[PDB]
Amino acid sequence: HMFSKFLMNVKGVTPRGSDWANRLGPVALFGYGAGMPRRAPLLDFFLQSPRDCDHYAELTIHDKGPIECPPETVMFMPVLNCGQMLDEAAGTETPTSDEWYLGSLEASTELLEKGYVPVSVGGDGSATLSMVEAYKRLFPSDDIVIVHFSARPSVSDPRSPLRVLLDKGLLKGVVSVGNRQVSSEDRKVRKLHKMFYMDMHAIYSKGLFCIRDIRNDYPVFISIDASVLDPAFAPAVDSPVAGGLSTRDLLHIMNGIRGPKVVGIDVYGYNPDLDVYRKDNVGLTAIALSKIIKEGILKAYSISTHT
Amino acid sequence: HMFSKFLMNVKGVTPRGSDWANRLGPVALFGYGAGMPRRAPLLDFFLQSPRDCDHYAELTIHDKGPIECPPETVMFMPVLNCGQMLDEAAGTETPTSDEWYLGSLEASTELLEKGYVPVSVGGDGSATLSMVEAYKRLFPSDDIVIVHFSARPSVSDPRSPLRVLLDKGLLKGVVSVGNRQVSSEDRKVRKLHKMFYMDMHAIYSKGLFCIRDIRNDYPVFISIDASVLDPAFAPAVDSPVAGGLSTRDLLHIMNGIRGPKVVGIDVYGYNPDLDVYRKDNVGLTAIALSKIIKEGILKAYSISTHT
Amino acid sequence: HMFSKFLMNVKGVTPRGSDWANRLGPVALFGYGAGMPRRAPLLDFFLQSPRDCDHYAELTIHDKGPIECPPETVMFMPVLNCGQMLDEAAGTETPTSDEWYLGSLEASTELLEKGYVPVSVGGDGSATLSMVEAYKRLFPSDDIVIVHFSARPSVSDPRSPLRVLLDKGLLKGVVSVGNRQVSSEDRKVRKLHKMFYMDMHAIYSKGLFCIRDIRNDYPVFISIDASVLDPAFAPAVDSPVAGGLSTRDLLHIMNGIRGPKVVGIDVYGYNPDLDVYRKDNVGLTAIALSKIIKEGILKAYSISTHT
Amino acid sequence: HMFSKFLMNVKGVTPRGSDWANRLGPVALFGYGAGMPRRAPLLDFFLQSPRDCDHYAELTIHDKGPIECPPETVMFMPVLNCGQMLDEAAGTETPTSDEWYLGSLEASTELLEKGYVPVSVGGDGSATLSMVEAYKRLFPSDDIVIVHFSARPSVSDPRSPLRVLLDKGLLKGVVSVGNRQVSSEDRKVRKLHKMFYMDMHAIYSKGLFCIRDIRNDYPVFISIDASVLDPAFAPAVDSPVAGGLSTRDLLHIMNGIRGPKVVGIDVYGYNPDLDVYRKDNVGLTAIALSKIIKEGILKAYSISTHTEEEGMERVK
Amino acid sequence: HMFSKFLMNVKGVTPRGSDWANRLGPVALFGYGAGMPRRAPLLDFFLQSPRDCDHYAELTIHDKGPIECPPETVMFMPVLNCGQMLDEAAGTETPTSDEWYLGSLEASTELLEKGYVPVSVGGDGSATLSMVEAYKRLFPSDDIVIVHFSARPSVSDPRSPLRVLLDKGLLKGVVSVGNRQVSSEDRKVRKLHKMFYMDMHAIYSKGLFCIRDIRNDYPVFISIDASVLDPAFAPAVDSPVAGGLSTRDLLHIMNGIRGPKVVGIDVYGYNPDLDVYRKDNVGLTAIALSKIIKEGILKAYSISTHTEEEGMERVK
Amino acid sequence: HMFSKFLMNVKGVTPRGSDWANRLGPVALFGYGAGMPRRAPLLDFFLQSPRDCDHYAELTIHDKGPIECPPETVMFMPVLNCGQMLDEAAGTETPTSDEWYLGSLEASTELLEKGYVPVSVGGDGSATLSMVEAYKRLFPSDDIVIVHFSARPSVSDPRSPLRVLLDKGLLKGVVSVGNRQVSSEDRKVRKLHKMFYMDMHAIYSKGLFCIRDIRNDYPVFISIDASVLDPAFAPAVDSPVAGGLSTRDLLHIMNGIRGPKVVGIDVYGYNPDLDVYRKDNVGLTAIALSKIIKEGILKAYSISTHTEEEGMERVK
C-alpha cells in the first residue's frame, strides 16, 4: 500500500547485465521494518559508513542503474540501493505482518528474477521467510541451506520465520550459530528437523578462531540476528543475553561460510530505542551492524564452495 | 532490625526434603545490599530474566516451598527465592556493616542447616565473610577453598572479607582469578598465606579457552566481583580497570571449577549509579551479572571434583 | 603563545640524573590537544587512576624534580608530569596546527636532551610527527621504527603525520597493527614505502594471543590511535569501525614490542564529545586509554630487543 | 585338503551365548597366508605377546568354547583362537588364489553366523575381499564402510581386493588413511568412486594428534596394510615407502575409529623374509604388528558411533 | 672378589672441593651389570661418544681427581669415570643378586658422602633400589621423588625394586612416565601407593611437546628403563612393547624434569644380545642410550624447581 | 681417467629447450662418491624406486635428451639421469679429493650452462662446495642462500665445505636445520658468520609441524646430510647422533623451503657398510634417502618465494 513507491521502483530495475552470468552478484539492498519502530535509521547509517571492506575490496553504491560488471583487477562491488520499503511520508498506518510479508515476497521475487542478490536490512527476521520462499518458487530444483546467527534457536513458535520454512520443507538444512538460550522445546524441534548447531559455549571452548573448514555445495541464505552479538557490542536487541559473540568473532565465522552462491542475506533484530548511544547520539549496535552488512555483501560476491 | 521480615521468612523455610541428600542442592537465593545504594534492582532483574541456561537445563524459581527433587531426566533446578534482606519499606535507617554481617550470618546459618546452598546477590563482598563463617561453624571438620574472581586481590585492608577469613584460618586455600591491579602489599599477603593466583595477562597469554583441567577435592565457595569483567561488559563498578574478562570468558572459566560441593556463591560489586544504560534504561552490568548468577546456580547443581 | 607557561616549565626541567645513563627512562608526560576540543580531561583522568601496573611494578608521579633512579629491587617508575601544553585559562584563541607542531617540537627537543622519554597524551596524532623529528634532529645517526596501532593506515593524505615522516625519510620502518579499513590508495603507499602490516582479521585468524616473538634492534616510537580498539571498548573516536581490538588484546600485543629503547609514545584519537558515559559521567574510552598509557610507560622502562 | 583341519574346527564352534545380548563381540582370530611365504609366524608371535592392552583391559585367548560373556565390569575380552587356515603339516601344495578366497569366504561366513567378529592375520590383503563379501552376503541390509590403512591406495589394479569391492558396489564408503604413493590412475579411481582420503603429508601438517570427531553410523571393516607404517617400524613389506606412520601414530588414529560395530578386521602385508631382525632373531615388524592386532581386537569390543558432547552437533 | 678392584678405587676418591659451594654436581659415573650378560659395552660406548650435548655444554670425563669446579660460565661438566663394577678379568663367577645390591649400596654410599651425584649405567633396574636406599640412609631428612621411565609400571612383583622402595616407605612420590603395558595388579598397586602416572597414549593425545610446568621441590631420582622407547629406537630390551617414545621424545620429557637436585640416575634395561646391529656391529640401542646418559648428566648439573613466570602461581 | 666416460656424456647434453621459457627445471641427476666406499648403490636404488611423489606428480627419468617440457598441467617432472661420475669398470684407482672437486666442478658447470638444476647423490658433502662455486662463477650477480640439514654444524674445521664457502664470501646466508651436536668452536663460527640456525630441540619443543612462513627471495642450495635423520631412520652415517628427525619430519620441513629457484641439491652422508639391513639385504637408509631425493627434485620444480596471504606482510 505505502510500499507502492518502493515496489514500483524495484519493478523498473534494469535486469542483470549479460556479463553478470558466470559471475557472483550483483547485490540488491533494501530496508525492512517489520516488527520494529517506524524510524529505522540502520540502512541510512550504512550508506553513510565507509565503503572499504576488511578484505581489500570496496563497495560501490548506486541509487539507480545501469549496474555493470567491472574488471576483477580493480575489484569493485556494485550495490543497488533500493532504499526503504516503507514510505515513511506516505502515511501513519502501520503495515500488518501479512503486508510486510507480501511486500517483501514481491520485492524479492522481482530482484531475484532481475538477477540480483537481495540484502534486507532491519526488521524482526520475518524477511528471511519471504525471500527464501521467493527463491524456492523461482528455483524449485535448487536445495537451500540457512546459516542462522542468533542467541536463540527461534524455532519454538510455529509462526517463527525459521519454523515455517522447515515445516513447509523448503530448506535442505539449517546451521544455527551462537545460540546461548535453548529451551527444551527448541531441542525437540532441533531433533525432529535434524538441525546442525554450534552453541556459544561450544564455539568458545573449541578455539573460536579455529573455525575455517568443511565443504558445502548448496546455495546459502545468510540470516543474521543482532542478538548473536554480546550485549556489550549490540545492546539494541529485545531481551539481551550476555556471553555472546564479539563483532570480530562474527566477521571471522561468516568469512568461513562456504557455498556456490548466496541466496539472500537478512540482518535484523535491531531496535534504535534499545541502543547504547555515544554523546553525539550514535548507537553502538548501528556501528556494529554497519560492518556486518558490508562483509555480508562481500561474502555474496566472493563465496566459494570449498578450498 | 528491618531484616526481621526477611529473617523470619528464612526461619520458616521448609528443610531439605529427604530425597535431596546424596544430591547437590537445592539453591537458596537472596539479595544483599551492604555498601551499596538502597535501590538494589539486580535480584529483581535476575528473576525477570529468562531461565534457560547455557547448558541444556532450566532454573525453576519458587517464592515458597515445598522444594522437592525432580527426575534427573527432566533436569529442572529449583531455586528458592528468599527475596531482599533489606525491607526497603520498613524504614530509612541504613544498616551498619556489623548489622549486615549479623543478618547475613544468621540467614546463611539457617539456609545451610535447612539443607540449602546459599546464593547472595549484591553488596560489596562482605557477604562472602558471613556465609563462609556460617559454614565453618556448622562444619568445622570440612576444608573450604575460595575461588575469587576480581580485578583486585582485595586482601590489602586487614578488614577485607577475604583477609579476615585468612587470618582466622577458615580457608584451606584461595584461588584468585583475573587480577590486573596488584599492589606490592597484595603480593606480600599472597606470599604469606600462599595463595594461588592467575592474573589477567597470564590467563590471556596462555590460551584463555585452554582452561579445563586439574583436580580439587575441597568444597568450594565461589566469590565473584563484577570488576573481574572488562568495563566494556561491566561498567557499574567502583574504580574500573580496563583489560578484563568478557562475560563469555568468565562463564567458561567458572564452568571448569571443580569440587565435591558448592559452599556458597557471592555475586557483588554492582552499583546501579555507575552503570551504562540502554535508551530504555536497562543497565549493561545487570544484563551481564544476570547470566553469571544463573550459571553460578547451575554450577552449584552440577559441580564435580574431577573428570 | 599560550604554550608559553608549559614551555618555560619544560625549559627548567632538571636534566637526567647521572645514574640514569645505562638505564631506560625516565619518562616525561604531557598533554596534547591538537585537532580536539579544548576540554581535554584524559591526562587528568590518568593522573587520578591507580598506579599499579599489569606487571608487578608501580608508577610514581612527580609534578617536579628531582627525578632520581631508585633501586631495581623496589621497582618504582618515575613519571615527570609536565601537565597540559595548552593553558586553558590563558585565552580563548585556538592554536593552529602549525602552532601545535612548533610547541610540540620544542617540548620534545627539550625533554629528550634533558634525558627524558616523552609521552604525549591526547590530540589527533600530529604529536607523532613532531617528537619523531625532534629525536631525528638530535640523533641523525640512529634509525627509528614506528609501531603504529590504528583502525586505519592513515597514510592516504600527504599531510598525515605518518606520511610526512615517510616522505622525508626519517623512519627505518613502519609496523602498522590492527588496520581494518584499508583503501586502495593506502595499499599503494604501503607498497611504495614497504611497510609491514598485520590487519585485524589477519591477527585474529592466526592466534591473537599467539604473538610474542621476532627480534628488533632499532629504537621504537609507539604511536597508538584509540580507533584500533573496538568501538565497544573505545567509542570516543571519529568515524568508528567495528571489529577491533579489545583492551586486553592491545595490552598483550604492545607487551611484545621489542627494541633497545623507546623513542617516544603517542596516545591519541580521543574525543570526550564522542564517548559513552556511565551514569556518573565517566567515559569508557577514558578508562581504556588510562591503562594503555600506564602500560606504555612501563614498556618505556622495560623494553628489550630480544629474548 | 590344505584347509581341511582348520575348516572343520571352525564348523564346530559353539555359537555365542545369549549372555552377549546386544553386546559387542566376541572376536574370532585366525591365520591367513595368501600371497605370503609358507612360514607365517605372526599369529604364533601374537599369541605369545603380553595380553594387557594400551587401554585398561586384558585379552583372554581361548582355543575352544564356550566363550563366556564376562561380568559387566571386569574388562576381559575373550578371543577365540581358530589357529592357522593352511595346515603345513598336511600336504606340501600351495593353495591357489581362488582356493584362499573360498577358504576365507567359508571361514568368515561360519564365524559371522555364529555371532563372532572375524579377525584375520597375515596375507596380502585378499582377506579383505573375502570376509566383506561374507558379511554382505549374510547381511545385504547393512551398509558397510571400510577404513583402509596403507602407503598405497591399492585400487589402480582392476583385480585389487578394494577395487573389486567397489566395482561390485558392496561398500557405502571408503576412508583411505596414510597414503604416500598415489598414481594418476589411483586419483582417477578415487573421484570415480568418490572415496574419502587423508594422505600422509596432510595428516602430518594438520596435527597428527588432531584427527577429527566426524560421526559414523555405518559398520566398519578395518583393513590394515603394514606398509602404512614407516619402514623403520615395519620394514617387512614389499616395496617399502619411507615417510610413514609410527606405531604410536597408528594406534592413536585407529583408536579414533567410529561405528556401531566392527564387521571384521584384516591385518596384512607382513613377510618374515623382508624383516629387520634383532640378534635373537625377533623381527621388528612382528613386534609392531602384534600390538596393532591387539588394539584392533579392543576396538571391536568398544567401538562407538560418536562421543555425545553437549552444545555441538556431529557431522555425519 | 669381583667388585674388589672397583670398590677400593671408589674409596680413594678425593671428595668434592669447596669450590662446589652450593653448586650442583659433580657427577660420578660407573658401570652396573646385574641381571645382564657379562659383556656390558654400554659404558665403553658412551665414553667413546661425542662430548657435546643438546644444550650448549660439554662433558669432561676424568678417571681420577681432583675434580676442579670450572669457571662460572665456561659450561664444562666434569664427570668422574669410576669404571666397571664387575671386573671380568679377575674371576669368572657371576655375582648373586644380593652381592650386586651390596656392591651398588657401598659404591653409592661412598660417592654420595664424597658429594658426588651417582650415575649408574646398565643392569636390570636393581640399581634404583640400592642407591635410593644409600641416599635415604645418608639423608633420612630429605623427601625423595622418583621419575620412572618404562613401558611397564614394574611394581606388580612384590620383589620389584620400585615396589620394595614403596613398601619400605622411602619415597615421597612416584611419577611413572610412558607406560603402555599395565596389568590389573599394577593398577591395584598404583592406587594403593597413590602414584602419579602418565601412560603413553595419554602423553601422545595431549600433545607430546605439551607436558606441564608443575613445580617440584623434592630431590629427584631418575630411573630410566630403555623399554620406554619404541623398539624401533631401542630393540635391545626383554619383551619389547611397540608404540613407545622416540629418543627425541624422551630427551624433551626428561628435560622438563624439575627439582632442587638429582639424588641419582640409573639407566638400564639394555642387552647387547637383543639389539639391532648395523653392518659394522654397532647396536641401535647403545647409540640411543649414550645420548640419554649424556643429557641425564646435564640434567644433574642444571636441574631447577620451577621457572618463575610473573602473574601466575605454580601447582606443587 | 676415472671420470672420463661420465664427463664426455655430460658435455654432449642437449641444452634445455625454449619451451622452458621462464620455467623451473629441468633437473639433472648424477652420482657422486667422494669420501665414500667404491660401491655406491644409492643412485641405482633410487632409479628403481617408485616414481610417484608425496604431492601429486610423477618423476620421468631419461638417460638422453631432448628433454621435452610437458603440457602445462600433466604434472610430469623430467629428470636427466647422467649416471655415475666414477666409472669403477675403467680403472681401479681412487680419485683424490681435488680430483673429485674438479670433476664435480666441471659437471656442475656444464649442466648449469645448459640450464639444468644439478642434483648430486652420495659423497661426504664435498659436492656442496663444488656446485655452489660452479653457480657463483657462472652467476656472480645472484645471491645464494644455503639450507643445510645436518646433525652437526660442520663448520668447525677450516677445511669444511660450508666453512670454505663462508670464508670465500660466496653466500648471502646460511640456514642450519636439525643440529644436535654443537661444539664451542662451532658457536664461535656461527656468530662470526652470522648464520641462522634452528637446533633439533628447538624444532621439537616449538611444534615440529609449526615451522614459519618467512619469505625468502634468494636462490637456494639444499645441502642434505643423512645424519640429520635419527639413526633409527638413517643409521648408515659416520658417528651417529640419536635424537634426530624422522623421514616424515624432514619431508615436511624441506617442503617449506622458499625461494625463486633451487641453485642445486646435494644428498650425502650415506655409507652402505654402516647401514641396517633387512633379511633381503635392503638397507633402511637407502629406502629413506630415495624418498628424500625424490621430494628434493619435486622442490626444484615447484619452489616459490612466499605464499601471498591477504592482510599480513611477510618478514624477509
In this structure, what C-alpha cell is assigned to residue C120?
604525549
Q: Does A182 touch chain B (CB under 8 A)?
A: yes
Residue D131's alpha-carbon distances to B195, D105, D110, D124, D223, in angstroms, are 62, 6, 10, 14, 11
How far apart CA B239 and CA C45 sit, in angstroms, is 12
What is the C-alpha to C-alpha distance for residues B225 and D62, in angstroms, rounded to an integer? 63
Asked whether the beta carbons of residue A202 and residue D315 sit closer than 8 angstroms, the reply is no
Chains that touch B (3 or more CB pairs under 8 A): A, C, D, E
Cell numbers linked to E284: 641401535
Beta-carbon neighbour count of residue E207 at 10 Å? 12
The answer to whether F262 and F300 are in contact (CB under 8 A) is yes
Identify the closest residue of chain F to E56 by CA–CA distance: F182
Nearest C-alpha neighbor of E248 from the set D233, F211, F244, F233: F244
How many residues in chain A? 307
Question: Which grid coordinates are listed for E293?
Answer: 646418559
User: B223 in contact with A at a CB cutoff of 8 Å?
Assistant: no
Pairing of strands E58-62, E145-149: unpaired
Grid coordinates representing E118? Answer: 651417582
Q: What is the DSSP string of D71-139?
A: -TTS-EEEEEEEEESS-SSS--PPPPHHHHHHHHHHHHHHHHHTT-EEEEESSSSHHHHHHHHHHHHH-
Spell out a b/e string for B167-205, using b for 16 or more CB atoms within 10 Å of the CB, else e: eeebbeebbbbbbbbbbeebeebbeebebbbbbbbbbbb
Q: Would you call C290 an interface residue with chain B, using a CB distance cutoff of 8 Å?
A: yes
- C-alpha F54/C-alpha F291 separation (Å) is 9
Per DSSP, helices labelled H in chain A are 4-11, 42-48, 97-113, 126-138, 161-167, 184-192, 200-205, 247-255, 284-302
Q: Report CB contact under 8 Å: A202, D312.
A: yes
Residue A107 CA to residue A111 CA, distance in Å, equals 6
- Which contiguous run of DSSP H or E holds residue B262? strand B262-268
**Residue E140 neighbours by CB distance under 10 Å:** 8
A193 vs D: CB within 8 A: no
Residues in a beta bridge with D62? D80
| Minimal Cβ distance to A200: which of B50, B248, B282 | B248
CA distance readout (Å), D85 to D14, D32, D95: 19, 6, 11
- All three cell numbers of B306, joined, read 574431577
Q: Which grid cell is B273?
A: 549509579
Hey, what's the cell of F101? Answer: 672437486
Non-local CB neighbours of E158 within 8 Å, separated by 6+ positions: E167
User: Is the minimum CB–CB distance between A211 and chain C shorter than 8 Å?
Assistant: no
Q: Alpha helices of chain E — where are they, by DSSP H?
A: 4-11, 42-46, 97-113, 126-138, 161-167, 184-192, 200-205, 247-255, 284-302
CB proximity C198 to F under 8 Å = yes
Tell me the structure's resolution in angstroms, rounded to a single decimal.
2.5
* Residue from E313, E314, E315, E316 to probe the interface with B (highest B Cβ count within 10 Å): E313
- CA B11 to chain CA mean position, Å: 22
* Count of other CB atoms within 10 angstroms of residue A55: 18
Q: D273 — contact with chain E (CB < 8 Å)?
A: no
**In chain E, residues 41-60 whose CB comes closer than 8 Å to chain F:** 50, 52, 54-56, 58
C71 preceded by a cis bond (ω within 30 of 0) = no
In chain F, which residues have their Cβ closer than 8 Å to the Cβ of E52?
Answer: 181-183
Of the CA atoms within 13 Å of residue A291, those in its CB half-sphere come to 29
Nearest chain F Cα to E245, which residue?
Answer: F243
Question: Dihedral through CA A17, CA A20, CA A22, CA A27, nearest 10?
Answer: -140
CB atoms within 10 A of CB D39: 10
Which residues does A260 contact at the CB level (< 8 Å), separation at least 6?
A217, A218, A219, A303, A305
Assign a CATH topology to domain A1-307: Arginase; Chain A (3.40.800)
Neighbours of A280 (CB within 10 A): 12
H or E element, residue F149? strand F145-149
Among candidate residues E184, E195, E181, E276, the one with its CA nearest the CA of residue E227: E181
* Whether the Cβ atoms of residue C144 and residue C132 lie closer than 8 Å to each other: yes
CB A265 within 8 Å of CB A222: yes
- Which chains would you list as touching F if contact means 3+ CB atom pairs under 8 Å? A, C, D, E
In CATH, the architecture of E1-316 is 3-Layer(aba) Sandwich (3.40)
Q: E89 phi and psi, to 5 degrees? A: -60, -55
Q: Is D308 on the interface with A (CB under 8 A)?
A: no
To the question of whether residue D225 is assigned a binding role by annotation, the answer is yes
- List the single residue in E187, E231, E277 with the smallest CB-CB distance to D279: E277
**Residues E310, E312: Cα–Cα separation, whole Å:** 6
What are the residue boundaries of the structural domains of chain B, listed by start? Answer: 1-307
Instruction: State whether the Cα torsion D60-D63-D69-D71 is positive or negative.
Output: negative
E284: closest CA of chain D, how far (Å): 10
What is the H or E stretch that residue C177 is in? Answer: strand C173-177
CA of D247: how far to CAs of C56, C263, D202, D253, in Å? Answer: 48, 55, 18, 10
Determine contact, residues A81/A111, Cβ cutoff 8 Å: no
Closest alpha carbon within chain C to F314: C196
Do residues C50 and C139 touch, judged by C-beta distance below 8 A?
Answer: no
Could you give the C-alpha distances from E228 to C286, D108, E179, E268, F71, in angstroms and in order? 58, 38, 7, 11, 52
